Design a protein around this ligand. Structure first.
Ligand SMILES: Nc1nc2c(ncn2[C@@H]2O[C@H](COP(=O)(O)OP(=O)(O)NP(=O)(O)O)[C@@H](O)[C@H]2O)c(=O)[nH]1
Ligand SMILES: [Mg+2]
Length: 176
């Protein structure tokens, strides 16, 4: 019965272990799933959101982060309008991988894809390995909006997905 005015394909991308699957599950179900294991292929969720009285259906591909699946994950960029690019604030390696993820999206996605950078596991701040300020500098240098999120608590998860959609809606309306 429920309709929508817009349909967008999104990805969730980033190194294994960063919390991609937990982020999608939090956005859709509003709970932390704590038995989550490695995605061995691709998972899907969808949700309709209300953006200013416009209903936007998000079709979201939660991709495998393990290196062994990289050629598979790369096949998903085509047709994606938006992506959440995720690292783990407690794992510097996952943050150091970000340049490679952005190189992939530059080569394989639409030049107009909207990417939101998510520093996840913010609830694990006592084990932080990446500063807010330093990630903020990187995002700015890369023309990306940046949020710290927690799949566990929900902090900024709805905001990340909604803002990706709002930025795509803005492109549709005006400019580039
Ligand atoms: N404390 C905390 N743990 C989290 C958070 N998000 C994910 N985790 C935990 O981190 C681990 C990896 O999460 P998961 O969502 O499976 O990661 P993934 O990015 O989907 N991995 P893959 O790419 O291999 O599928 C799990 O043990 C999960 O419970 C978070 O915000 N806070
Ligand atoms: Mg996963």
């Amino acid at each position: 019965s429920e309709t929508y005015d817009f349909l967008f394909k999104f990805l969730v991308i980033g190194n294994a272990g960063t919390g991609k699957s937990c982020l999608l599950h939090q956005f859709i179900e509003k709970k932390f799933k704590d038995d989550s294991n490695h995605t061995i292929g691709v998972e899907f969720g969808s949700k309709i959101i209300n953006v200013g009285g416009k209903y936007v259906k998000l079709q979201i591909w939660d991709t495998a982060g393990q290196e062994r699946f990289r050629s598979v994950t790369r096949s998903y960029y085509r047709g994606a309008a938006g992506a959440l690019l995720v690292y783990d604030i407690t794992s510097r390696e996952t943050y150091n991988a970000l340049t490679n993820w952005l190189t992939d999206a530059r080569m394989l996605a639409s030049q107009n894809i909207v990417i939101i950078l998510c520093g996840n596991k913010k609830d694990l701040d006592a084990d932080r390995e990446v500063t807010f300020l330093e990630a903020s500098r990187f995002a700015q240098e890369n023309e990306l909006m940046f949020l710290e999120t927690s799949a566990l608590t929900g902090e900024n998860v709805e905001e990340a997905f909604v803002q990706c959609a709002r930025k795509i809606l803005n492109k549709i309306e005006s400019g580039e």
